[PDB]
Design a protein around this motif. Structure first.
Motif, short mmCIF file in Angstrom:
data_model
loop_
_atom_site.label_atom_id
_atom_site.label_comp_id
_atom_site.label_asym_id
_atom_site.label_seq_id
_atom_site.Cartn_x
_atom_site.Cartn_y
_atom_site.Cartn_z
N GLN A 208 -36.04 -45.63 90.72
CA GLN A 208 -36.14 -46.08 92.03
C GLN A 208 -34.54 -46.78 92.53
N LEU A 209 -33.43 -46.17 91.84
CA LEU A 209 -32.31 -46.55 92.22
C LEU A 209 -31.77 -48.04 92.09
N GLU A 210 -30.80 -48.57 92.41
CA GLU A 210 -30.43 -50.18 92.64
C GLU A 210 -29.96 -50.57 93.73
N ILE A 211 -30.53 -51.52 94.18
CA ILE A 211 -30.35 -52.28 95.55
C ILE A 211 -29.45 -53.43 95.10
N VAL A 212 -28.58 -53.76 95.85
CA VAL A 212 -27.39 -55.09 95.97
C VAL A 212 -27.32 -55.34 97.28
N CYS A 213 -27.00 -56.96 97.36
CA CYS A 213 -26.42 -57.53 98.83
C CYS A 213 -25.14 -58.18 98.56
N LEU A 214 -24.02 -57.55 98.77
CA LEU A 214 -22.78 -58.53 98.58
C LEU A 214 -22.72 -59.54 99.90
N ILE A 215 -22.01 -60.68 99.11
CA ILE A 215 -22.28 -61.89 100.14
C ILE A 215 -20.77 -61.82 100.93
N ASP A 216 -20.66 -61.97 102.25
CA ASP A 216 -19.38 -61.97 103.15
C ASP A 216 -19.83 -62.42 104.47
N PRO A 217 -19.14 -62.94 105.28
CA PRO A 217 -19.45 -63.32 106.81
C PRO A 217 -19.17 -62.40 107.77
N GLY A 218 -18.79 -60.93 107.56
CA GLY A 218 -18.37 -60.11 108.12
C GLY A 218 -16.83 -59.94 108.22
N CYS A 219 -16.37 -61.19 108.15
CA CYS A 219 -14.68 -61.36 108.31
C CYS A 219 -14.03 -61.32 107.08
N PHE A 220 -14.75 -61.23 105.98
CA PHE A 220 -14.32 -60.81 104.56
C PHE A 220 -15.06 -59.67 103.76
N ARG A 221 -15.20 -58.48 104.70
CA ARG A 221 -15.98 -57.24 104.23
C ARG A 221 -15.07 -56.29 103.46
N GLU A 222 -13.75 -56.44 103.50
CA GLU A 222 -12.81 -55.50 103.10
C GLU A 222 -12.71 -55.82 101.60
N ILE A 223 -12.66 -57.15 101.26
CA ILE A 223 -12.68 -57.85 99.80
C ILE A 223 -13.93 -57.20 98.84
N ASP A 224 -15.09 -57.39 99.18
CA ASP A 224 -16.49 -57.06 98.67
C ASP A 224 -16.37 -55.50 98.34
N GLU A 225 -16.02 -54.67 99.41
CA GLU A 225 -15.98 -53.38 99.33
C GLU A 225 -15.06 -52.47 98.52
N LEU A 226 -13.79 -53.17 98.65
CA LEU A 226 -12.74 -52.45 97.63
C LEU A 226 -13.04 -52.14 96.33
N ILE A 227 -13.55 -53.36 95.75
CA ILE A 227 -13.92 -53.00 94.07
C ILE A 227 -14.89 -52.00 93.97
N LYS A 228 -15.87 -51.92 94.89
CA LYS A 228 -16.92 -50.92 94.75
C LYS A 228 -16.05 -49.24 94.96
#
Lengths: 250, 217
Positions: A205-225
């Motif tokens: 059934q795959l893996e679900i995740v929820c990365l924590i940001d306010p919208g104004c720090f969405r570059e940092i969470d995604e970069l790693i990914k």
RNA sequence: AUUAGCAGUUUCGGGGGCGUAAUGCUCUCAGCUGAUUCUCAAACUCUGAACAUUUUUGGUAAGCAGAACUGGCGAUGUGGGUUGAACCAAAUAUUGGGAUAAGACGUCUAACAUUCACUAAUAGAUACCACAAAAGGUGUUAGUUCAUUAAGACAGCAG
RNA sequence: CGCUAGCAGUGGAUGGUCGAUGCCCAAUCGUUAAAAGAAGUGAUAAUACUUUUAACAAUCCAACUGUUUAAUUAAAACAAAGCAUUGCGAUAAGCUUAAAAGCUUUUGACGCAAUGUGAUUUCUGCCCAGUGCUCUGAAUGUCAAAGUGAAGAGAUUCAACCUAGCACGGGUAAACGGCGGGAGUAACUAUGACUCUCUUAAGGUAGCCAAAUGCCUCGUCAUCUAAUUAGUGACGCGCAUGAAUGGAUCAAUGAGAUUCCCACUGUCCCUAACUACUAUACAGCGAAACCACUGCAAGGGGAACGGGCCUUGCAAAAACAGCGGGGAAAGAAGACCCUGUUGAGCUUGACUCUAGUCUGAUAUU
RNA sequence: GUUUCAGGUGGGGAGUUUGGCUGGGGCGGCACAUUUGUUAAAAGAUAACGCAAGUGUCCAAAGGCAGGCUCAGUGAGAACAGAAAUCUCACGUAGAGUAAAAGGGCAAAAGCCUGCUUGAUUCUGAUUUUCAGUACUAAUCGGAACUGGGAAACCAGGGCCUAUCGAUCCUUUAUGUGCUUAAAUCUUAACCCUAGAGGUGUCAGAAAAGUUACCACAGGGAUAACUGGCUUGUGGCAGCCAAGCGCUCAUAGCGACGCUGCUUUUUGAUCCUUCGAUGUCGGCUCUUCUUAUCAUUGUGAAGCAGAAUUCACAAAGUGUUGGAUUGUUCACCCACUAACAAGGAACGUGAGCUGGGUUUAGACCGUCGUGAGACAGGUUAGUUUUACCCUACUGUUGUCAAUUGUU
RNA sequence: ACCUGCCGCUACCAUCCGUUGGAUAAUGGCUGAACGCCUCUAAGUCAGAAUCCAUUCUAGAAAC
């Protein structure tokens, strides 16, 4: 000689000068300081009101009236009213001090407003107040800049406010769906580095995740990914005012 | 024109300009309306007409005219109502005013402010009137005379100079006097037109005629 | 160029009321047509006029700028307008007398009487010309129209 | 001035008077037109003349010493050591000279010539498209004269051949220089590494900043002051900063530029006193610039700000010492500005030329 | 190497030019040669940087000629035909079109269509237009050749008319094979003669780029920078009107759209005055005056209870401040005060001052310029002469330099 | 040079001295008409400004 029989003089303007460099040629115009702003605010008050003179200058400070060849070449037209209008719309506009201050004031409000969109949540019925933030900003003192965007300014200055101290803003759930193989890998890196919630690894059934940001720090969470596994199966983006389901963070 | 003081133009001088394929850059007239009260009123009910006239030959600004009309349109209501006033004004503004701008100057000049290329650009639409030429005109019932003269009076303040008020001797918007209006009814020559009278008259523009009495009757 | 309603239309436009709804009628409102109405259109015109005064373009104007006809001023003065290049009369050889012009006539300053009004104002006092307006006055003068009045008015006071 | 209950004001009425160089008449002189002659010149003997008739504590900058515009600029300008580039191995380079000839050269790259920057300290990013330079470039499109081939009877014409430079192709930016504009772009990012695209080759790196560089502008913030268009420190899409056009730093240095504090209080509100000296009086001794005429005002009109004009206010010999309102005071045919078909000094990718130089050619041979 | 010619390079140097109009001059424009309507005032002539527009061309057809036709538009019809294609018919004095602007002209045409054509030819004489009764352009009118078209009548000097364009010189073409080339003569070459072409748009016709704040001369108030003058759009102040506010209530206090003034303390416009030289901006100093009165004196209104405030009359009699910052009036703050009102006097007040700006030269930057250089940009340093004349003022003698007594 | 320094000048770096009558403006009233009432006005009159003009002070005339 000058000293005897008139010693002569110089004279200064008090009229706005809307300027635009097209084809390496400065064109300018004759308008007033507190109209040229008002034109752009959707206060259509006749064009003949905002223009003190209908003509174009190479330099309206001295008074060098502009040339037909120069005009047509630079605008694709020699008709002057239209050109003037264009200049008014496009070119740099000189303004008074009071006028300048107004803009600054507006910006001040704006940077508070942007902070207020998502604020500290004990439940979900507390702060979301513009005023307090504004007050804080005022009392800490920082240069409000017209070249700097509002959001950016807010981002810059919230840090400062933090060590006042005053806690601000709230995080939201930008949700994703990872693959089966790479998801696990991602989890291995992203668990201690940043906050990750609603994690549920599966084979089928795959893996679900929820990365924590306010919208104004969405570059940092995604970069790693991006570095690790690239984009997910689905990438959920939500609004930068509320998290779609009521905020409970900070 | 509200920019200028109108002292500048309240004397009928310079041969008269117009809107045309020649004067394109005009603003739009202030008054674009000549309709005050019940336009759908019959000619056989409002037998009075009062008139206001410019005592003096002069120009008469569009703005001024507009201002005047709401001394006869607020005052339409407090006295009588819509069922008394029928106004066609009886002057329009075709004539235009130019403005050689030197406002440019507020500290120095470029010299184009001077009289080289002097000719002004269109700015201010306005009427021209002699002394007789009529400027307001209320066709009304004959229980409303002092409650319409005071509208006219009020208007007069908002015109430059001297303004005379009057009542005619006719049914208003007609050539024919009150004495000769009763003839029409009596002689079977009254022909209604919802506002006007055509007034039936024998004539000959045909070959051998008899419908010239039997047309409108 | 542009104002108004009217009528005749609606298998042409739109929305209502009348059998569900329309364009079937009847409405306000679109379009077209017919008769009437408002202002007539320097570059429209069926018709058609005999510096200063007159005409006139620019110009808010200017003792600004630019034309027309006549007159002056300027290369002629004198009297008159206090004075004044241009307005009034009127043109200068040099004089005498007479009568005038414009302008005056309490005094300055040559020149007067008579007569009727009006103004009572720190006023008002001859073109050009030395500014005055819209708007007010139960100031006084002069008028005009309608109303009232011996069936007794008006104001007053009394019921 | 004054006027007022008829006014000498206003609007009339009926007469009347004053009054121009105008008009009438008269006279006198000239002019004109016409005519006349013994010119009241009835013994003269005049016509070139007379007469008649008529009309008119801190910041900036510069490294420091130094130097410079003798009678206005002593500085932040110049110079300078250091740093950098360029040319040149002698029949050189640079230069002067009409020519002859000469200098740098009593010189030889450890130098001389020519630049540019301006000590140190640390740094000097990208660009060769331009314009200049540079060439040992591909060698050929153009390419003058002489020389050559043809035609023509010749003058002559027409053709090929073709050097330099030009054109073309490379080098060159501590050479002159530039270091964008429009789309998106490191959550919109502050900014722009980036990607598209155009212009011309590139599109501002290090740094720096309302700077002796910021129009807006008294920018925004902090500070300094009770209060600061000032100062300093921050911020920086910077109207228009930026790397030998040198960028940033800075000890010492400075008759340089600015701020604040302290010593300063007659460079303190508020003036005072005192002496010298001149002035002031005398005695001798004696001067100029200037000067249409001239010197009382208000108002008016007038080349529109009068001492004179006009109408009013008024007015009292001769003078002294102070003062600076007036004489649109004086000094200077304003050089600010415009004009004149007036010039000059300088500049350049004006027009025209030219020294000199590079190549070609004849002769010298 | 020298020579002498040749080509190149050559602001190192020389000599020169760098138009004009102009509501100063630039910047801008072209109103510099010309065409249309209006300006233009019922012949004509008439200006402005007055207005709305055009010109530097095009067309073997968009010429010439005859004939034949009718156009714009509308209506009612018709497989295909779309509302609107094409094809009928009626009605259509022109609303169409006629190369281009606008005005005119115009319907058996000047439009459209067809045919045939090259009068878009040559010589000559007269004239028109503007006129300088000159030149040119463009046009008209006839006469002679050569043609063309149509039965002919007739028309055809290019464009329906008004615009569409160019001297001497020089060169070059065309032409009679003309004329000379001056001792005869021949062949060339060369010049003439006659008509065309090359072009000058500054359009009756110089070969022509800058800067000068290192500058200079001759003149200009024909013409700018300060004042003053007229003017007052702009500025400042004041009235009238009353839709509305003022709870309610138009005018206690305000007052819309709108309308009339005054002012000269704003700035423009103008260019009369001055370029035989009014010393330009501020500050200090000092008086005077104006009132459009901030305070105070006295009064009257108020939404004036008291308090304080607001509004108004008389009135200019007396007050009208201390400072930071700014060259600065202006500006903006701090502080006092009863109040810290606006103005005028050559933008009061330079032989009263100062020179902080503005005002020359030296010089730094930044932007601009190939550069010399530019800047209503910033920065810095830059000699402020003279009263011993008249008047005016201040004080100081003296005098009716006797008014017809001394003292 | 410095201290002290009479006489003399001089300091809000000290001391003393700065009046009263009429006439009004605005304006508030009276009596009172025109306009039998009314009304501060017309005839008339009252009160009334830091205002005006006198008193005060300065000067003292081609004035006695």
């Amino acid at each position: 000689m000058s000293i005897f029989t008139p010693t002569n003089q110089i004279r200064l303007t008090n009229v706005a000068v809307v300027r635009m460099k097209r084809a390496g040629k400065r064109f300018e115009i004759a308008c007033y300081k507190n109209k040229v702003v008002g034109w752009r605010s959707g206060v259509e008050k006749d064009l003949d009101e905002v223009l003190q003179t209908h003509s174009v200058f190479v330099n309206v400070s001295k008074g060098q009236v502009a040339k037909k060849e120069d005009l047509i070449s630079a605008f694709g037209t020699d008709d002057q009213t239209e050109i003037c209008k264009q200049i008014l719309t496009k070119g740099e506009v000189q303004v008074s001090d009071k006028e300048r201050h107004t803009q600054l004031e507006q910006m001040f409000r704006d940077i508070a407003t942007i902070v207020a969109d998502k604020c500290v949540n004990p439940e979900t019925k507390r702060p979301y107040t513009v005023i307090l933030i504004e007050r804080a900003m005022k009392d800490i003192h920082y240069s409000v800049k017209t070249n700097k965007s509002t959001k950016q300014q807010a981002l810059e200055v919230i840090k400062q406010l933090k060590e006042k101290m005053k806690i601000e803003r709230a995080h939201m759930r930008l949700r994703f769906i990872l693959p089966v193989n790479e998801g696990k890998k991602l989890k291995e890196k992203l668990k201690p580095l940043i906050k990750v919630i609603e994690s549920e690894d599966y084979g089928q059934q795959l893996e679900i995740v929820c990365l924590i940001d306010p919208g104004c720090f969405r570059e940092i969470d995604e970069l790693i990914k991006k570095e690790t596994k690239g984009k997910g199966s689905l990438e959920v983006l939500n609004l930068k005012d509320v998290e779609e389901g009521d905020e409970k963070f900070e | 024109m509200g920019r200028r003081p109108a002292r500048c133009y309240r004397y009928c001088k310079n041969k008269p300009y117009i809107k045309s394929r020649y004067c394109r850059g005009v603003p739009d007239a202030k008054i674009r309306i000549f309709d005050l009260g019940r336009k759908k009123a019959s000619t056989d009910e409002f037998p009075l007409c009062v008139h206001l006239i410019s005592l003096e030959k002069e120009q008469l600004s569009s703005e001024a005219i507009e201002a005047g009309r709401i001394s006869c349109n607020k005052y339409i209501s407090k006295t009588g109502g819509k069922d008394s006033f029928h106004m066609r004004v009886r002057v329009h503004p075709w004539h235009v005013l130019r403005i050689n701008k030197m406002l440019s100057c507020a500290g120095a000049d470029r010299l184009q402010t001077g009289m080289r290329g002097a000719f002004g650009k269109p700015m201010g639409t306005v009427a021209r009137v002699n002394i007789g030429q009529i400027i307001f005109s209320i066709r009304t019932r004959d229980n409303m005379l002092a409650n319409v003269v005071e509208a006219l009076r009020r208007s007069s303040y908002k015109f430059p100079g001297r303004q005379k008020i009057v009542v005619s001797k006719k049914w208003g918007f007609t050539a024919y006097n009150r004495e000769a209006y009763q003839k029409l009814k009596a002689d079977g020559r009254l022909m209604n037109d919802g506002a006007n009278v055509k007034v039936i008259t024998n004539h000959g523009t045909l070959a051998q005629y008899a419908k010239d009495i039997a047309a409108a009757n």
